[PDB]
Design a protein around this ligand. Structure first.
Ligand SMILES: COC(=O)c1c(O)cc(O)c(Cl)c1CCC(=O)Nc1cc(O)c(OC)cc1O
Ligand SMILES: COC(=O)c1c(O)cc(O)c(Cl)c1CCC(=O)Nc1cc(O)c(OC)cc1O
Lengths: 217, 215
């Protein structure tokens, strides 16, 4: 259940963290962007697979803040990942050599990271820990967690609560506490969701005080 | 041949690098202290083993600056390490649980107290190489950039006889440690109380090079 990252991934995390410390908010752009890719995938699969969406009919991204627990959640109903895919996709990597060289050489790298598709790791810019809960049509719900020094995968004792999809949960660093404020999240989400072809919601309040999903794009 | 560090070691390296960020020269103190501890060990073994010192009759620490190659070498003739010991002592970590918590909660003394000062070489080095020859094994080489490490049989064979050479590929901004003046100075400070003789390969005035005793 306990694994170690591939060497090149440790290097990649360091390059990303060191070259973006000046524009941390980008982590949110990357999470929403990965959410959108996952949503496109299940959509492509639903063209050939008639049972594709049976686990969860919607195709959405739902963002929620939990100030009391110091948590930020970003949930999408994309294709999700199997246990083997969590271990492979997040703990290893496969023209990587050049990318690292370009990153190192460049060291703006915001565009580089997006183009290569390794934006997930920019989550370590604001999080002391990253948790990935996923449910893929071909497997049971699993959980991936990491503080960047190793990672582990376990079967989710809660069972299948996602239906289909992925939740990226971030345990925010103390200095990243500002991302727990609704005003800030709504503003960032709105900016980074303008060109995403799937509805994106943020759990927010409204005037008694009532909480409910608020469309951002 | 390729290995990954234990999770605890990765955490430890970060804790050590982030706390001593303002007093980097301390890496030299730790390398010399570890050198010393390796010598005490072979000295002890030699008390109960007539052939202990057969591979190399001396008990010393020799420091060498290779400016051109950007390398710093620290060689001792202690007990050395087998292939299995390089992998275990350097890639895994002992009351570690509490130490990490204590580090998190000055760290200079703490690191010295737990004996994990080796990792402070990463404060001034982009890559760290450890060549070692133990009586019970052939010479091997351990190398790391901190993101992983590998251990290979030393193709040069037994050149140490017995002992360990710590080789640091100095970061561009750590280049100051390649100056004889500076290393001589630091060595003289952290060697005042080391029971074994410590030498620095230095020049004297024509210009000749030779071992100069610093303690
Ligand atoms: C499979 O895509 C996902 O389910 C998904 C998601 O829905 C939200 C996310 O924030 C992320 Cl990170 C993912 C996984 C994206 C992916 O394709 N995995 C992946 C991630 C990497 O960092 C990577 O680095 C080389 C390679 C990957 O395949
Ligand atoms: C075995 O001791 C050595 O031969 C030696 C040496 O001669 C010079 C050195 O710079 C070092 Cl690091 C060593 C190894 C010291 C040791 O006993 N191993 C060791 C080193 C660590 O850094 C450590 O960290 C948790 C644990 C160890 O056991």
């Amino acid at each position: 259940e306990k694994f170690a990252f591939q060497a090149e991934v440790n290097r990649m995390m360091k390059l990303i963290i060191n070259s973006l410390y000046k524009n941390k908010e980008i982590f949110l752009r990357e999470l929403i962007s990965n959410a959108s890719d996952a949503l496109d995938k299940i959509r492509l699969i639903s063209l050939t697979d008639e049972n594709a969406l049976a686990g969860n009919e919607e195709l959405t991204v739902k963002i929620k803040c939990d100030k009391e627990k110091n948590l930020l959640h970003v949930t999408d109903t994309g294709v999700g990942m199997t246990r083997e895919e969590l271990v492979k996709n997040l703990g290893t990597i496969a023209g990587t050599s050049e990318f690292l060289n370009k990153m190192t050489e460049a060291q703006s790298t915001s565009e580089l990271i997006g183009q290569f598709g390794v934006g997930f790791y920019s989550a370590f810019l604001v999080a002391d820990k990253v948790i990935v809960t996923s449910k893929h049509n071909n497997d049971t719900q699993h959980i991936w967690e990491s503080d960047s020094n190793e990672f582990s995968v376990i079967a989710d004792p809660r069972g299948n609560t996602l239906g289909r999809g992925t939740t990226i949960t971030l345990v925010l660093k103390e200095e990243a506490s500002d991302y727990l404020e609704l005003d800030t999240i709504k503003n960032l989400v709105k900016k980074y969701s303008q060109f995403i072809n799937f509805p994106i919601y943020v759990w927010s309040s409204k005037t008694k005080t009532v909480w409910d999903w608020e469309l951002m794009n």
